[PDB]
Amino acid sequence: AMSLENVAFNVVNKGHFDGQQGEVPVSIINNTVYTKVDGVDVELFENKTTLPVNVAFELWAKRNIKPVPEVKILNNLGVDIAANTVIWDYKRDAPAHISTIGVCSMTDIAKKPTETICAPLTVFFDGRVDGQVDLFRNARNGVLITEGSVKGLQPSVGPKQASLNGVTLIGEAVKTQFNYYKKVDGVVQQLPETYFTQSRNLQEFKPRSQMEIDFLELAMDEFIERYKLEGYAFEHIVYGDFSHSQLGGLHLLIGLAKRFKESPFELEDFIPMDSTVKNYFITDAQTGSSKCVCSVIDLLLDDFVEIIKSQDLSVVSKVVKVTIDYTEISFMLWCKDGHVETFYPKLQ
Amino acid sequence: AMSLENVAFNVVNKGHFDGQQGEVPVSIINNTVYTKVDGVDVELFENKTTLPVNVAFELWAKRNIKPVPEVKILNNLGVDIAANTVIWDYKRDAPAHISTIGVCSMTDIAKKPTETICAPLTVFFDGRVDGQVDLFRNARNGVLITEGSVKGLQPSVGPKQASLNGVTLIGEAVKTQFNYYKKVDGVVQQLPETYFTQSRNLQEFKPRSQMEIDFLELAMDEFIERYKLEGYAFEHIVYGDFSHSQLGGLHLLIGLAKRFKESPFELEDFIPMDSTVKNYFITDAQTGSSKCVCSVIDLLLDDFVEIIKSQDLSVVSKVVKVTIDYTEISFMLWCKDGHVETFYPKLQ
Amino acid sequence: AMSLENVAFNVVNKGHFDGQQGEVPVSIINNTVYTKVDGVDVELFENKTTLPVNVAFELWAKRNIKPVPEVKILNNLGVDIAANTVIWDYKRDAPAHISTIGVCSMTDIAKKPTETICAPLTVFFDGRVDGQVDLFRNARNGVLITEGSVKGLQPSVGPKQASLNGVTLIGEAVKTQFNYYKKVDGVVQQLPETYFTQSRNLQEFKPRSQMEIDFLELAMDEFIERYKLEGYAFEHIVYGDFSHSQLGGLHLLIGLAKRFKESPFELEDFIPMDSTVKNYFITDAQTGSSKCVCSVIDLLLDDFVEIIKSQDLSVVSKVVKVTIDYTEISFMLWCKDGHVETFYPKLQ
Amino acid sequence: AMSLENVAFNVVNKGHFDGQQGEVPVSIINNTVYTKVDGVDVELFENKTTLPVNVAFELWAKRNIKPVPEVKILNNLGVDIAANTVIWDYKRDAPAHISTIGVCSMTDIAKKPTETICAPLTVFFDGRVDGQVDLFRNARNGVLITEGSVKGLQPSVGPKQASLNGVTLIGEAVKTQFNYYKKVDGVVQQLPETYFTQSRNLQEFKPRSQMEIDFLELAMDEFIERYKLEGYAFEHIVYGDFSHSQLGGLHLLIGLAKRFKESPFELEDFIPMDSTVKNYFITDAQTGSSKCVCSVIDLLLDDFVEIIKSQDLSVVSKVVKVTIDYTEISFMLWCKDGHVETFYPKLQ
Amino acid sequence: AMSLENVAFNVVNKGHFDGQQGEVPVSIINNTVYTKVDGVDVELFENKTTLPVNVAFELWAKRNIKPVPEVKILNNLGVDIAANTVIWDYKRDAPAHISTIGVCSMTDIAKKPTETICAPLTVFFDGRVDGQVDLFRNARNGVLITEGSVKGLQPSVGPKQASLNGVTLIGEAVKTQFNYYKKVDGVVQQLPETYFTQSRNLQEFKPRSQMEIDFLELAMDEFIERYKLEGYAFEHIVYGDFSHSQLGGLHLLIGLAKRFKESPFELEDFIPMDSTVKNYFITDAQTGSSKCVCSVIDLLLDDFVEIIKSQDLSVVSKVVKVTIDYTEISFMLWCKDGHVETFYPKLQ
Numbered sequence A, B, C, D, E: 001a002m003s004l005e006n007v008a009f010n011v012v013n014k015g016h017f018d019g020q021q022g023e024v025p026v027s028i029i030n031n032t033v034y035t036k037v038d039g040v041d042v043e044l045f046e047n048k049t050t051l052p053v054n055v056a057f058e059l060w061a062k063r064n065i066k067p068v069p070e071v072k073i074l075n076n077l078g079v080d081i082a083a084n085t086v087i088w089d090y091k092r093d094a095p096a097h098i099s100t101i102g103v104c105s106m107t108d109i110a111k112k113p114t115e116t117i118c119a120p121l122t123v124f125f126d127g128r129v130d131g132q133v134d135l136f137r138n139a140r141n142g143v144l145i146t147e148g149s150v151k152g153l154q155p156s157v158g159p160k161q162a163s164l165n166g167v168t169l170i171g172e173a174v175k176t177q178f179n180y181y182k183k184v185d186g187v188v189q190q191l192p193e194t195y196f197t198q199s200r201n202l203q204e205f206k207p208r209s210q211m212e213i214d215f216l217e218l219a220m221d222e223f224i225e226r227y228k229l230e231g232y233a234f235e236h237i238v239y240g241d242f243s244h245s246q247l248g249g250l251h252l253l254i255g256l257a258k259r260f261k262e263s264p265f266e267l268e269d270f271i272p273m274d275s276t277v278k279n280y281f282i283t284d285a286q287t288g289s290s291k292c293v294c295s296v297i298d299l300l301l302d303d304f305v306e307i308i309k310s311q312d313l314s315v316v317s318k319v320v321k322v323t324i325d326y327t328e329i330s331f332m333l334w335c336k337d338g339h340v341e342t343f344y345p346k347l348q
């Protein structure tokens, strides 16, 4: 007995949709859902999606509240829809997927992922829910996550972090590192070797290696000397060049975090969504150095060093493809006289 | 178990709210309620009210579908709210009353009219519903309608017509003529002796007496002669004067209907609501004669003739009060040398 | 080079999208599209759909302007989407289908119906457009219309009428009678033998047989005698019973048209969409007789007479299934002592 | 002391803005203005303009309620703004001009047309208002209307009709025929000799000459014979050709009115605005003959006959320019062997 | 070939409008512009302006991304419009000017500033763009900025700071200090002697002189003694009096910044826009001292001291006019017995 009043009752009483019986009075005005609490209207939800307000409210109430893969991972693996859950995309304040399976009458394409409409779609299966590992075994197309071993299936160790209620974290009280499995046309794929983005924030950036601790503590010249990075253009690529009108380099999140502690800058997120590489219109407040499209990736500094140190530096311009978060990221590598000039990811 | 989906189920299946169990998928976008019918969205309701869209949809679905008093009668009797029903105002596409009693969780001030919050309000009671005559006897303030005698209660015979689903009609298969009763401060009130407006339309106007048939068929001078109306200014008041830039008289609906058959005119209903006297910004298409505020009343011509013929014509300007639809209507009577110059209602 | 400004240029210059190059200034405010014409804004389109305003504007500009099957026929045939066209649903002021193929970047699921995403959908193909008959032969699911023979494909002669720019008509200067073909799961289906609804309006109803001329001209008793309809309850079913509070029968459009010429009535179309059987909340203005759900079908009176005269009248209540517009319509047949009491369609 | 509450008071009490003192309670919700009338909200105005709702409400309340030139005449004369009035465009439900002079604080560019910001704009002046003829003499650019002679100013006799509260009429109780004057760059302009469009409606079309009476009453062949119109293609141009899929000719309103009495058709007004030539997407209901862009002009048939009979018929294709409503209308004249094939206006 | 899809393509690919060819799918819902990125809608722009959403999106995409004068400077110099650019007002999330020149079809009054419509408007010219210094030389009204000397024109050295993408900064990698020139009616004006506001923030306030360093570091009595400020009411004016219900003084930003480091307070910016003097409704969180209108100016403390020390202190109340950011700012000076009581700017 699904209803707007029942969804609102669950939100008011349980903090989310929890299958509880009951109804609260609701009013819908424009894109906002309100409930009457002792004579006055209290806002329950503001629709920031392109779906109708009551539909978006239900999908948000029915969001997955366990740690789930970050949307950038699901997208990179070609996930089209989730089985009997809603992956809420907190970067976009919207459902990660257009349609649902056994969640909401307005968005459901099926009640069960075994329905033939789901066969061509890459369905997301969560092995932590009963029957989902078996539902993946019988699905034509899908991605499965598990906390442990699956009989017969060889696993791909995913990122250490997952998203719990929009907070990306490496779980200590919960498991966030999943095994990944994928199937294309009934065939269990061999997931490629991949680096993972670290999903850190600029304001609360924490180093995750001794090289990252040394990058933040040491001065530029000391760090480059200690890690034998001469000729790799870390001064441009990682530290950033704020001497000309166009801001130079600055493509690694750790470098932005280091700069941020000394002087602030503006990052205009002009395509706000979860993605492996992020593009920002950056304006350095101290110098006025700026760049319309500054591609930024949060790789562990050690991984970035391994990638740049594994390239041939004998050609002027070249595309360097690197598997990151299961997707192929194209980087542009610019060299001169056997040394790096610049190396930057491309969002495409 | 009230819900938006259940209200929509009742609308789709029963043509209105009928207390049936069930749910249909609903989408709300802006001020419109839609339901999915085989993959596509079909409009169920467009909110033209100042209430939230889902609330207005529920009150409209819960509208009274029996013949009910016209909103102008309820307003003239000081009705503030209805007991356990919604009087839908089809002229405003909105509920006739702001609040409800035992109808909808968002608009209810009480579940029963016996609650103390209802004591200062004039509650509308429908004697055709079980227990409502008793609820009127117990109410501090109220208006009651019945199809027959209530023991000991002196009745007021109401208009012949009532509104059935927005159609004003004199019932042949249903009863539309009710007995009216009213209480103020716990005391039953003697309703005044009154004329009633006929509630006719300009396009489909039908005469309801031989005098009205004669008005429509006869030329101006032969009608005035036949009914001894010389000196009563019917040429100005009823027929209308379209010779000057300001349109003269034209205050009786029958006169507008007569004019309409020969040449069209525009009636701008600038306060669109049901009322005993209506004000229109009129523009005669044939002549260009116009009037910003032309008060129009639909009285039976015989009743209008009785009213004007019952006045003293010896004073220049005078206020003539006439009880119409239970309310006191002020008419302005202008005379010169023992004859009427003009006589017009005032909407106030 | 698709754009909002180009779509608006085509609307302003060609009356619809015509593939012409050019741009006009456009402003979007709320759900309306405007264009600047000599300093002032002129409305080009008001969005009444659940799609974004600029998207609905493009689909409406790209609507099919040739005679196309009425939406009720497409729905009854299970059509999900159209190949490289937009069937505009003029009854809902919206696209007949949610998604498109090779029409608009926002709604396209594919550029060509041969794409695998289209295989499970019943694609509408128009044989009057080059390559579409071949696309139907290659489609897993589809409905095809043609003006002539397709080699080896057994045809179904469709209705005489089609919709041309929202006007349902039997073409004299254009062909409106198509051959129909349908495929389910790669297999051509034999379309059932069917009656067709006449698609007439209440206000402009025209008889299409001598029996229909006789129904409109003759009094009830002389028509029933002339066509030997005694015991078939045409008095209730077709003429309508306006003697009780609940309006009796009145399920054939011709009967509503006959009643409409004598006295008016209100038809509340509470599910506004094209369908073989329509449900209305009817209120007779003369009597006050009303019915929340009055199912109405526009069959040619001769076809209705053939259907009712082909039934066994020996059981109290029985479901009578009749193929109308290719769909199975359930009728409820109520009998007593070898005579019809009532026979009515059910909208389900 | 201008205010929203004062504007609403004037609308409620005077039918429009009348400069009266007072305030009524107002509520604004979305694009609608409401006022509280005895506890309930009554709609005063629905904004159909691109201006803010409270601003559009004020301009509409301050609209000119005297007969004013039709917007097509003002546009054809290059009028940009009006001096101390609002010309309300009833065809667009919006102000005819973006800005105002001495009307409303939000839209005013100046309080008086003598302000230098008004010098480059063509200001509309109404000689019926004190001081406006003097303001025209002092204006660098302007259009003036008067009911009589202005000393030394050579007049242009305008159309017989004017718009009074959105009703186009030839005044009997009011004057609608004005003298026109125009100034460009401080210099009075000689207005060209012109025909005028008749501004009639399809539904209520009335003939204004014996030739127009004969067109409506006589069959095609007897009218063409009576008025010696053989070889002028009136069969195509005026009567219309409904024999092919593309509707032929039908460019004179009288021809559409004649067709409309026999069988109906759809006229899609895809650029809804007042203009000398109108373009419609026409669909003939009887035949299915249609045309995306059918240019229609309402000229008096005698004037159209004079124009076509004054042309040289010796060239295949030729542009014929005709002054209509003060503007140059391009007509396309197609001939073969000394006879007209087609002659049609172009809306550009 | 300007279009909504092309503007969105440029935003997605270049971070702003950069003249690139291409189109992305766009959806407009209410006041938000979205683009489809791999099946889901991503927000590109939320309209906070009074212009139509697609128009505001284009002007924002076409904003000037070089350091430009702060809007308060342009306004104070009487700039009406900019030549071939959009000055985006980041304080209002809107274009600084109503109209444009050679930018957007919906807002353009001209394509080039040499068009006669621009002659009476004070056009903003940017000497860093080719031909703009020469366009100013020929313009009737205008303001010009340059990074260097203009032949014949004597310059006004502007503020050290400019706005780069909404970040006000003193450029180190870019030039932010411009030379200003202005022309009224073809005559090159002599810009007055002026102080400049420092445009600092409360949270990140940095001192720009030894007096400002001493103000922040020293206690009130030490600072007043060191700079001989006894009798100038700095205790009230600059430090602020938080001892009574009405907050005393606190009109210099440096004083608010000093207070902010010890205890927080609320600043309600009730007229959110760029202006030389700002008015705030301030509520001190520690004491509860508050003031509805607390005028605040960010002058360099040395400049404020020079201004207050250059006044005659012999009258009770007096208006002191000071040129700040090229505009005349009126301050109220209140004195008693040859000492300052208060001195505050007025926003008007």
Ligand SMILES: N[C@H]1CCN(S(=O)(=O)c2ccccc2)C1
Binding pocket: A017, A018, A019, A020, A062, A084, A085, A101, A102, A103, A104
């Ligand atoms: N297929 C199932 C799994 C997800 N849903 S649910 O509607 O979101 C839901 C969530 C919690 C309790 C009860 C129901 C139904």
Ligand SMILES: N[C@H]1CCN(S(=O)(=O)c2ccccc2)C1
Binding pocket: A171, A172, A173, A174, A175, A176
């Ligand atoms: N609650 C306690 C009991 C076991 N765990 S745990 O969540 O499964 C876990 C284990 C290892 C790494 C990260 C998380 C913590």
Ligand SMILES: N[C@H]1CCN(S(=O)(=O)c2ccccc2)C1
Binding pocket: A271, A275, A279, A347, A348, E012, E013, E037, E038
């Ligand atoms: N530099 C531009 C080029 C296209 N994009 S994109 O639409 O935002 C995108 C993001 C992630 C995956 C796929 C596409 C950025």
Ligand SMILES: N[C@H]1CCN(S(=O)(=O)c2ccccc2)C1
Binding pocket: B017, B018, B019, B020, B062, B084, B085, B101, B102, B103, B104
């Ligand atoms: N107080 C009672 C009387 C009116 N209401 S109701 O909600 O409108 C309703 C109407 C018809 C069926 C079931 C419920 C409940």
Ligand SMILES: N[C@H]1CCN(S(=O)(=O)c2ccccc2)C1
Binding pocket: B171, B172, B173, B174, B175, B176, C243, C244, C245
């Ligand atoms: N069904 C028939 C039987 C009696 N009625 S009635 O509703 O009681 C009625 C009574 C008086 C006036 C008008 C109608 C109609």
Ligand SMILES: N[C@H]1CCN(S(=O)(=O)c2ccccc2)C1
Binding pocket: B076, B077, B078, B182, B184, B189, B190, B191, B192, B326, B327
């Ligand atoms: N004793 C008399 C005094 C007035 N009334 S009344 O019933 O309260 C009433 C009020 C307004 C309209 C119609 C009737 C009875």
Ligand SMILES: N[C@H]1CCN(S(=O)(=O)c2ccccc2)C1
Binding pocket: B271, B275, B279, B347, B348, D012, D013, D037, D038
């Ligand atoms: N002529 C104007 C004066 C005020 N009104 S009113 O607000 O619409 C109104 C109508 C009926 C009762 C009470 C108020 C009309």
Ligand SMILES: N[C@H]1CCN(S(=O)(=O)c2ccccc2)C1
Binding pocket: C017, C018, C019, C020, C062, C084, C085, C101, C102, C103, C104
């Ligand atoms: N797949 C094709 C068929 C329909 N479309 S279209 O975009 O609606 C269109 C219509 C008319 C002219 C040009 C384009 C492209």
Ligand SMILES: N[C@H]1CCN(S(=O)(=O)c2ccccc2)C1
Binding pocket: C171, C172, C173, C174, C175, C176, D243, D244, D245
């Ligand atoms: N233009 C004329 C020539 C032939 N046609 S037609 O379109 O092919 C047609 C065929 C059959 C029925 C109705 C119409 C009309």
Ligand SMILES: N[C@H]1CCN(S(=O)(=O)c2ccccc2)C1
Binding pocket: C076, C077, C078, C182, C184, C189, C190, C191, C192, C326, C327
């Ligand atoms: N063999 C028969 C069984 C049914 N069909 S059908 O074509 O698939 C069909 C489905 C729905 C409506 C009209 C026709 C053919």
Ligand SMILES: N[C@H]1CCN(S(=O)(=O)c2ccccc2)C1
Binding pocket: B012, B013, B037, B038, C271, C275, C279, C347, C348
């Ligand atoms: N009598 C009610 C029962 C449900 N409907 S329905 O949703 O409008 C519908 C109509 C046609 C096909 C399928 C569904 C009408």
Ligand SMILES: N[C@H]1CCN(S(=O)(=O)c2ccccc2)C1
Binding pocket: D017, D018, D019, D020, D062, D084, D085, D101, D102, D103, D104
């Ligand atoms: N410049 C004058 C002429 C028009 N306006 S007005 O505001 O529309 C107005 C109209 C009627 C009464 C009082 C004021 C003022």
Ligand SMILES: N[C@H]1CCN(S(=O)(=O)c2ccccc2)C1
Binding pocket: B243, B244, B245, D171, D172, D173, D174, D175, D176
């Ligand atoms: N009230 C009467 C008296 C004179 N007029 S009139 O307005 O001046 C007029 C003049 C010419 C044509 C049409 C109307 C009507």
Ligand SMILES: N[C@H]1CCN(S(=O)(=O)c2ccccc2)C1
Binding pocket: D076, D077, D078, D182, D184, D189, D190, D191, D192, D326, D327
């Ligand atoms: N000398 C002649 C040249 C043209 N004109 S005009 O008055 O400026 C004019 C412009 C547009 C429409 C109608 C009239 C007079």
Ligand SMILES: N[C@H]1CCN(S(=O)(=O)c2ccccc2)C1
Binding pocket: C012, C013, C037, C038, D271, D275, D279, D347, D348
């Ligand atoms: N046939 C199309 C061509 C452009 N238009 S237009 O924008 O509506 C227009 C109408 C009158 C004057 C100026 C422009 C119609």
Ligand SMILES: N[C@H]1CCN(S(=O)(=O)c2ccccc2)C1
Binding pocket: E017, E018, E019, E020, E062, E084, E085, E101, E102, E103, E104
């Ligand atoms: N007059 C010119 C200068 C400003 N514009 S523009 O549309 O904003 C633009 C910006 C960048 C590249 C191409 C065009 C046109």
